[PDB]
Amino acid sequence: CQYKIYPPLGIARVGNGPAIKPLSLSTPEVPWAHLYDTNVQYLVTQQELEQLLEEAFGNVINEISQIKTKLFKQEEIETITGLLGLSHLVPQQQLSRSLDNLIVQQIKGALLKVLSDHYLHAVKKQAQNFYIYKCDNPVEKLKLTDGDKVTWRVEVANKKSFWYDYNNALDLSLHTQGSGNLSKNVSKHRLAPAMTAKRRNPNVITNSLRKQLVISSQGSVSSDNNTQVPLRGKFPANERHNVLQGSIECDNEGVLRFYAGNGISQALSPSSLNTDFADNSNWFDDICDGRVTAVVELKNGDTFEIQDEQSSAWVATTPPDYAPQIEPIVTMYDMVSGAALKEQDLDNLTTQFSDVFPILYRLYRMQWVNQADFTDNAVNTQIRELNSELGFAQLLDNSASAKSLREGIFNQFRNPLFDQDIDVDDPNEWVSNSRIIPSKDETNIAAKPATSSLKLPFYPNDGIDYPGSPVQWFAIPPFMYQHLQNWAAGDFSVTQVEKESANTIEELGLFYSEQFKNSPNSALLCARGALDALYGGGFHPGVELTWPMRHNLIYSQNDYVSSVTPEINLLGLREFRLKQDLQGLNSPNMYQDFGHVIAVDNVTASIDPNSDAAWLWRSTPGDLTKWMGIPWQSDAASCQAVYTPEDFPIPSWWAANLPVHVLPLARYNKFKDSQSADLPEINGMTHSIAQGMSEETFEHLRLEQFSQRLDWLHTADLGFVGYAAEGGYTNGLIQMVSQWKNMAMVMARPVENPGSSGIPNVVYVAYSQ
Amino acid sequence: NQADFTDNAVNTQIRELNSELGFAQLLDNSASAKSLREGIFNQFRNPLFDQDIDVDDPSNEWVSN
Ligand SMILES: [Mg+2]
């Protein structure tokens, strides 16, 4: 092995912001890098656009005054147009049309308003950088000397419209001995049976014609030329719509940058409405995923092909992350780690405190995107109590005097064995005696009173379809619940250096974030950062990817490498690679399926890598995302709260990436100021009223404003606006196709002088119109 | 059912026979009546479900034509 690509699985997220570096974001390459960064701009700002324009006006001024005095005309027009390299951001004529209708300041002002209509407040694209690392096992990024060149290739596809309905995760009925991600109890006791699933777009018959339902494109860029190349397909493939699946550029140092599409979903007819959460015929979106390879050409003639599955990479595109600094409690990098573990080996797992802190830390931070974790979570309140007395470090104590404290917390978490809080129906059905989540199909018979408390966390899960099944609700996976169980029993290790930085949960998080920043394994951190912001459960189907990712069968390699720090694990770093069909879009299995339906029996038959059904795991382009909802906006609109007859806690699906209850800019502007602020308006009050009231009442008002959380579905018009509006679930799905780009985007923001109010110095604020 | 009134060729052929008082040829098992019996028989769907199909990429799938 000579050279490798990192990350092994790259992620790029759709956005209506442009595909240029100054106005786009980059997938995290180091976990926890910017959790408290109050300068983040995830939407396109006026200042960014203004900056971008003067850089085009940075020359131009000499040239326009030269025909200023030579007096517009249609090619006065074009000489002005040509020198502002802006035709890659807005169409030709929109620029010209805005000029023929009307002093340098009035071409700027006219042009600025064009970029502002297109891009102001636009959801920035989250692009993925890919790097070549020299090997011995990675040591260092490839460094091009003159004469050296790298050539990247990327082939992507979308098969959602070709694939099968998503009713629930087929692996729920897969016979297994159990993994780190999924206990054998689910299948063996039939807690959430996999359903059969029919074909999407079932009126397209014969494999030959169904090939039209698959969108695909490809392209190559080298280090000799940084011109951006689009990845443009057609639906249906070869009336007919172009689909920008992404774009790719490569800089002189050899870094590939991959931009996802614009977020465009569309039906073939306007009357075809996306009223189901996942399976809507006649629809296509611009989500893709596919195979990333490269070729390295040194000047001494030598050439190294980066093509095999150990060395090359994959890219998937996904919905946007509406709260980039709020991390899911269980992440896709956790599914990778769990997949390499066998359930009956968890007794040999060793536990440091840095392996359980992510669970408590991520759950604690869910308060900014989900009401239940802000006002109805007894463990997050216990953490606040410890913070308020600088006594968070007792959670790091593994001795007997702290066992009552650890155990009290651990006992509130749901056991992924799904064998607690159940009455066994006369032996063999497992029926929960905790709070169930009813079906919308009501039955006017008295509910059975619950006898056991509702465990944590309060999120729905793979088995939602089945009222009373313990798998309705989410549990941290087997290996992560094992870490938490060892912690509660005392069987864990932790360093004095950790203890000294552990007076509050924020201080320890900052400390651990520094351990990531200085760990010398950039190739493996980049591989883990790509996946640590993605969700890892529940899968119904989820947000970015779904249940195949939690099986080792999808990886050609999955190995523990090292801890993050020699003394600090932090759930570790791994070297993993997806299984790949090396023929790519030319694979003979590109267009394979299981006939009229897919069922767990097909999955069972795919376990054997020699069998005829093993292609399921050997990915061709489009295989990772084809499972998800078509269009994704129907999925996102479906991904919110699931109300129970009991008001609280409100259950939520995936609040860390698709938030449910957020803190809007409106409220931020009403608590961010102090009473002493030198502003004519203070927290939405006149100066005089703000400073006339007592300090007690002022801070109280701040805290009340801070406490107001707004349904995220209400941050744009999803069908509830206007007199007599219907609103409702279905209109949400329909409207999200256009409104996804207007939904609130959560960003860290400062509170310089919280005083006595109880508002932290960093708050997470939802920005929308 | 309308299709059996105005769109069923076998009902119509029965009509033709009835109109000539010639329905008894259907009870003829001889060779001279074979074409007539076959003509009605070949219009019926076969419950083997293996006619009027194209085998898609034989794993094999039966797709009606
Ligand atoms: Mg997030």
Cited resolution, angstroms: 2.2
- How many angstroms separate the alpha carbon of residue B47 from the centre of ligand 1? 56
- Residues A637 and A732 sit within 8 Å (Cβ to Cβ): yes
Tokens (6 digits) for A589: 């299995």
In sequence order, the β-bridge partners of residue A681 are A686
**Residues in chain B whose beta carbon is closer than 8 A to a beta carbon of chain A?**
54, 56-57, 59, 61, 63-64
- How many angstroms separate the alpha carbon of residue A366 from the centre of ligand 1? 9
CA distance A595 to chain B (A): 6
In whole angstroms, how far apart are CA A16 and each of A13, A343, A637, A648, B22?
10, 43, 18, 36, 76
Give one word for A55, left, alpha or beta, with left for phi > 0 and alpha for psi -120 to 50: alpha
Interface test with B, best of A199, A204, A205 (most B CBs within 10 A): A205
Nearest-10 crossing angle of helices A104-119, A46-56: 130
Q: Which amino acid is at A627?
A: W
Of A286, A282, A285, A287, the C-alpha closest to A270 is A282
Q: What SS3 state is found at A368?
A: helix
- Residues A335 and A292 sit within 8 Å (Cβ to Cβ): no
- Residues A712 and A326 sit within 8 Å (Cβ to Cβ): no
What are the strands, taking DSSP E only, across A473-589?
Answer: 555-562, 573-578
Tokens (6 digits) for A200: 């999407």
Compute φ and ψ for A382, nearest 5 degrees: -60, -40
What are the strands, taking DSSP E only, across A350-453?
Answer: 422-425, 429-432
Q: What SS3 state is found at A512?
A: helix
DSSP 8-state secondary structure symbol assigned to residue A673: S
Tokens (6 digits) for A87: 């035709």
d(CA A481, CA A492): 13
CA distance A157 to chain B (A): 22
Residue with tokens 């938490």: A484
Of A10, A98, A9, the C-alpha closest to A53 is A98
Task: Let me know the angle formed at the C-alpha of A201 by A200 and A204, rounded to the nearest 5 degrees.
Answer: 130
- How many angstroms separate the alpha carbon of residue A109 from the centre of ligand 1? 36
Q: Which residues contact A618 (CB under 8 A, 6 or more apart)?
A: A579, A580, A581, A589
R_g of chain A computed on alpha carbons: 27
Identity of the residue in B57, B59, B63 whose CB atom sits nearest the CB atom of A205: B63
Q: Which amino acid is at A187?
A: S
Q: Which amino acid is at B21?
A: L
d(CA A245, CA A622): 11
In sequence order, the β-bridge partners of residue A229 are A248
CA distance B1 to chain A (A): 26
Decide the pairing of beta strands A9-13 and A313-318: parallel
Number of H helices, E strands in chain A: 22, 27
For chain B, what is the largest distance between any 2 Cα atoms, rounded to a whole number of angstroms?
53
Compute φ and ψ for A234, nearest 5 degrees: -130, 140
Q: Which residues contact A640 (CB under 8 A, 6 or more apart)?
A: A652, A653, A658, A660, A712, A713, A732
Decide the pairing of beta strands A710-711 and B53-56: unpaired
Compute φ and ψ for A316, nearest 5 degrees: -125, 140
Of A186, A170, A189, A168, the C-alpha closest to A178 is A186
Tokens (6 digits) for A177: 């001995």
Check CB contact under 8 Å for A207 and B59.
no
Q: Which amino acid is at A118?
A: H
In sequence order, the β-bridge partners of residue A603 are none
Decide the pairing of beta strands A149-158 and A289-297: antiparallel
Check CB contact under 8 Å for B61 and A595.
yes
- Residues A182 and A471 sit within 8 Å (Cβ to Cβ): no
| Shortest CA distance from A588: residue in chain B | B57
Check CB contact under 8 Å for B63 and A595.
no
In whole angstroms, how far apart are CA A651 and each of A15, A362, A701?
28, 17, 28
Q: Which residues contact A450 (CB under 8 A, 6 or more apart)?
A: A433, A434, A435, A436
Compute φ and ψ for A453, nearest 5 degrees: -60, 155
Of A486, A430, A650, A464, the C-alpha closest to A539 is A464
Q: Which residues contact B31 (CB under 8 A, 6 or more apart)?
A: none
Q: Which residues contact A589 (CB under 8 A, 6 or more apart)?
A: A581, A615, A618, A620
d(CA A549, CA A474): 17
Q: Is A268 exposed, middle or buried (0-12, 13-18, 19+ CB in 10 A)?
A: middle
Decide the pairing of beta strands A241-250 and A256-260: antiparallel
- How many angstroms separate the alpha carbon of residue A398 from the centre of ligand 1? 31
Residues from chain A that touch B56, judged by Cβ atoms under 8 A, are 206-208
Q: Is A209 exposed, middle or buried (0-12, 13-18, 19+ CB in 10 A)?
A: exposed
Compute φ and ψ for A352, nearest 5 degrees: -100, 165
Check CB contact under 8 Å for A612 and B57.
no
d(CA A440, CA A438): 6
Give one word for A683, left, alpha or beta, with left for phi > 0 and alpha for psi -120 to 50: left
- Residues A424 and A467 sit within 8 Å (Cβ to Cβ): no
Give one word for A299, left, alpha or beta, with left for phi > 0 and alpha for psi -120 to 50: alpha
- Residues A455 and A176 sit within 8 Å (Cβ to Cβ): no
Which residues does chain A break after (C to N > 2.5 Å)?
Answer: 58, 71, 102, 136, 238, 427
Query: DSSP secondary structure string, B1-65?
Result: --HHHHS-HHHHHHHHHHHTT-GGGGG--SGGGHHHHHHHHTTSPPTT--SSEEEE----EEEE-
Distance of CA A673 to the CA centre of its chain: 32
Omega cis (within 30) before A566:
no
Identity of the residue in B56, B57, B59 whose CB atom sits nearest the CB atom of A612: B59
Residue with tokens 């030598």: A302
In whole angstroms, how far apart are CA A263 and each of A246, A272, A739?
10, 18, 11
Query: How many CB pairs (< 8 A) connect A and B?
Result: 11
Check CB contact under 8 Å for A206 and B59.
no
Check CB contact under 8 Å for B56 and A612.
no
Helix (H) or strand (E) holding A296: strand A289-297
In whole angstroms, how far apart are CA A717 and each of A49, A631, A712, A769?
26, 19, 11, 10
Compute φ and ψ for A266, nearest 5 degrees: -165, 145
- Residues A633 and A733 sit within 8 Å (Cβ to Cβ): yes
Compute φ and ψ for A64, nearest 5 degrees: -85, -30
Q: How many residues does chain A have?
A: 769
- Residues A61 and A34 sit within 8 Å (Cβ to Cβ): no
d(CA A99, CA A74): 10
Which method resolved this structure?
X-ray
Three-state SS annotation for A310-325: CCCEEEEEECCCCCCC
Residues from chain A that touch B58, judged by Cβ atoms under 8 A, are none
- How many angstroms separate the alpha carbon of residue A137 from the centre of ligand 1? 31
Interface test with A, best of B56, B60, B62, B64 (most A CBs within 10 A): B56
Compute φ and ψ for A218, nearest 5 degrees: -165, 175
Q: Is A299 exposed, middle or buried (0-12, 13-18, 19+ CB in 10 A)?
A: exposed
Q: How many residues does chain B have?
A: 65
Helices (H), ranges, A546-617: 600-606
Check CB contact under 8 Å for B54 and A205.
no
d(CA A386, CA A394): 9
d(CA A509, CA A507): 5
Interface test with A, best of B62, B63, B65 (most A CBs within 10 A): B63
| Shortest CA distance from A597: residue in chain B | B61
Q: Which residues contact A138 (CB under 8 A, 6 or more apart)?
A: A4, A6, A523, A524
d(CA A709, CA A655): 13
Binding site listing of A for Mg(2+): 321, 323, 326, 656-657
Check CB contact under 8 Å for B61 and A612.
no
CA distance A599 to chain B (A): 14
Compute φ and ψ for A334, nearest 5 degrees: -65, -35
R_g of chain B computed on alpha carbons: 17
d(CA A355, CA A476): 13
d(CA B65, CA B61): 13
Tokens (6 digits) for A515: 């351990």
- Residues A572 and A195 sit within 8 Å (Cβ to Cβ): no
Residue with tokens 């774009």: A247
Of A240, A174, A182, the C-alpha closest to A212 is A240
Nearest-10 crossing angle of helices A505-518, A353-365: 120
CA distance B50 to chain A (A): 16
CA distance B6 to chain A (A): 28
Compute φ and ψ for A740, nearest 5 degrees: -55, -35
Decide the pairing of beta strands A126-135 and A138-141: antiparallel
DSSP 8-state secondary structure symbol assigned to residue A663: -
d(CA A53, CA A84): 8
Residue with tokens 């190559």: A220
Tokens (6 digits) for A276: 């189901």
**Residues in chain A whose beta carbon is closer than 8 A to a beta carbon of chain B?**
205-208, 595, 612
Decide the pairing of beta strands A215-222 and A197-198: unpaired
| CA quadruple A277, A283, A285, A289: dihedral sign | positive
Tokens (6 digits) for A673: 């100021």
